[PDB]
Design a protein around this ligand. Structure first.
Ligand SMILES: CC(C)n1c(Nc2ccccc2)nc2cnc(Nc3ccc(N4CCN(C)CC4)cc3)nc21
Ligand SMILES: Nc1ncnc2c1ncn2[C@@H]1O[C@H](COP(=O)(O)OP(=O)(O)NP(=O)(O)O)[C@@H](O)[C@H]1O
Ligand SMILES: [Cl-]
Ligand SMILES: [Mg+2]
Ligand SMILES: [Mg+2]
Ligand SMILES: [Mg+2]
Lengths: 297, 297
């Protein structure tokens, strides 16, 4: 309707590759409004290789209609040549790179608040009857360090089908069943990446072996900073019975409760000194970057 | 509320382009690097013409706290300060620049709906300052910024105090240095005359030294080609010698909003029928990219 701008190729230019994935290649780009002299930074995802434009368009309107602070909305599309998706540029990049970069400077407050925020966005997708199919720390963007957003839901659907075996629920691997509860298993793996500061899951276990190890009951290890209460939640996200798994709305509650007493739930050396921004600093960041957090008691 | 003003270290930002200059300083595009991050976030930096002492500096700060407390969608808020020997003011960057340049650059290509809506928005911003008992002292089309073509904001609030534009000034300001909300209304009327002439220079061909004399004799800026009598009478009433005979900003808001509901009745612009006016789709896209903030007839 009014939510998806159909772009002409003259309107924008791709400038520099920012990354790539199973579904396409992301560029930092510029939008040049017609009749204007300005160049506005955007991100453009050019999709890999099917579907008629009407169908892609139908799917694109859904992507354009998500409205939640923890979910990136599709802003515009250009489907003359390839399919190019236009979205807001996030100069901070993805949460996986961010946590690695900052592994010596991230506190329990940030970590548990990101868990809440990602659960909030996934709960929203579930409300909207939308299954992501590809949740991972690489798919969560940093708008500010205090504010992250899920991206790339439903690309899996749009393009059909680099398959992310190590994030997938057992049922998706064996029977290709994808549901909101399989997304819960990926959220579990995503929390595991965060709490290990960006470790690669099952590192040195070939992808082919994953179903077998899971079937035996093997799982990702307890990250050293995690108290057992944290680790128990991840293990619950990885139960064989989909329906046994927590629901996103429950994960929001549980992580929000931990975020109130964060040093009770995560043990980080020097954590007492890593806290959320002062009001002074927060007001500034928002003004510049986030015009669009749970504290300890 | 001190939390509204961020105090910055010289080391966290850099100047990268000159954007312009005025009677109070030079404005730069700059980049802010959050300490410990790799990102470069564009800002506007105004560096004052006057290097100052630690003493003068504390006067500056108390006024900076006021500038930073301004919270309204049509007035720019001061975000940050650096008290380098040369005082620097940090504020959000607007890629579209000032409204004076914008209406000159689009000079006979702007529709009545835009012109009337800018007049509403500037009066809304000034009314907010009047509510707070703050006087701008330097309103002019050069000190209105374009955030998007649909959303303008007054800038430079507080500067004139912190540290003259005769052709924008009320007679009583020229004669006696008296500045009040009603002298700001005089300046608003000149600002509107700027916009309605597409950026003509006021009293062109008349030296500044002679302005008070012509005002005293009852001479006023002339009726712009596009302005109907109803619109011109509003402007003239802003320039009554008796300050309390001038309109209030609250009345200006009402009158211009009324006009904005039937813009072709009040401005007569060749080709107005074919001018761009903004579809919901184009507004959602500008807002998502450039204008997230909580804010048109
Ligand atoms: C230069 C002035 C109008 N300015 C102040 N002023 C200011 C006042 C107090 C504190 C900080 C800034 N804040 C500003 C924030 N943003 C922008 N933006 C902007 C300005 C100019 C330009 N261009 C490109 C087109 N060229 C024809 C002319 C230069 C492009 C973007 N200007 C600002
Ligand atoms: N909107 C954006 N703003 C800034 N960076 C982005 C944006 N979108 C994507 N990126 C970057 O591009 C990288 C990869 O993009 P993407 O095409 O999503 O592949 P992926 O997410 O890494 N893997 P895949 O799970 O297969 O999609 C992300 O990890 C980010 O580093
Ligand atoms: Cl702008
Ligand atoms: Mg992708
Ligand atoms: Mg993706
Ligand atoms: Mg200015």
């Amino acid at each position: 309707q009014a939510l998806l701008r159909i772009l002409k190729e003259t309107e924008f230019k791709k400038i520099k590759v920012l990354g790539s994935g199973a579904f396409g290649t992301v560029y930092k780009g510029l939008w040049i409004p017609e009749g204007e002299k300005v160049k506005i930074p955007v991100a453009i995802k050019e999709l890999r290789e099917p579907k008629a434009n009407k169908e892609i368009l139908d799917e694109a309107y859904v992507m354009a209609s998500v409205d939640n602070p923890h979910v990136c909305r599709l802003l515009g599309i250009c489907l003359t040549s390839t399919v190019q998706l236009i979205m807001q540029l996030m100069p901070f990049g993805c949460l996986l790179d961010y946590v690695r970069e900052h592994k010596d400077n991230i506190g329990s407050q940030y970590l548990l608040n990101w868990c809440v925020q990602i659960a909030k966005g996934m709960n929203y997708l579930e409300d909207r009857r939308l299954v992501h199919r590809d949740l991972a720390a690489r798919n969560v963007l940093v708008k500010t360090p205090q504010h992250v957003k899920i991206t790339d839901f439903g690309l899996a659907k749009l393009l059909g089908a680099k398959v992310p075996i190590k994030w997938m629920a057992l049922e998706s691997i064996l029977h290709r069943i994808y549901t909101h509860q399989s997304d819960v298993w990926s959220y579990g793996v995503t929390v595991w990446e965060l709490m290990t500061f960006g470790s690669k899951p099952y590192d040195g276990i070939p992808a082919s072996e994953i179903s077998s190890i899971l079937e035996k009951g093997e799982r990702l290890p307890q990250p050293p900073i995690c108290t057992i209460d944290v680790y128990m939640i991840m293990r619950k996200c990885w139960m064989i019975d989909a329906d046994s798994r927590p629901k996103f709305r429950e994960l929001i509650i549980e992580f929000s409760k931990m975020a109130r007493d964060p040093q009770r739930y995560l043990v980080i050396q020097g954590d007492e000194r890593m806290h959320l921004p002062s009001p002074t600093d927060s007001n500034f960041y928002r003004a510049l970057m986030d015009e669009e957090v749970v504290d300890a008691d």
